[PDB]
Amino acid sequence: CGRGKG
């Protein structure tokens, strides 16, 4: 997975 938004 990526870091994530926000």
Add this chain to the structure above:
Amino acid sequence: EEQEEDTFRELRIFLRNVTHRLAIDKRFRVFTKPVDPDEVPDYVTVIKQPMDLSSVISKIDLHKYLTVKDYLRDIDLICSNALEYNPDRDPGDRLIRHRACALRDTAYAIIKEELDEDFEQLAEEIQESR
């Protein structure tokens, strides 16, 4: 001859109508524009093929879908990108992941309910011979 393109014209009108219903659904606002590399700089390190509903619309208008199957491939890509990129920690992360599934489920439900299977089968088989 002429009849093959009426199938595709009719498919595009149908696809335009489905996409518009998805794109005005408040649940799917996050999928109506491309992910912004300025806001999410690491996105390109995870997701090789970005996709969103505004790109889906452009692709309809530019005759890139000959079948509902290819269209649903791109809906599926939108969902699977969101599941591959977004971790499952925060509530905001869960929310966007559930929304991605709901986007896929809603597109499939609409298509299951409204799409004639023999019309789709004709589309797929015209695409084959070409």
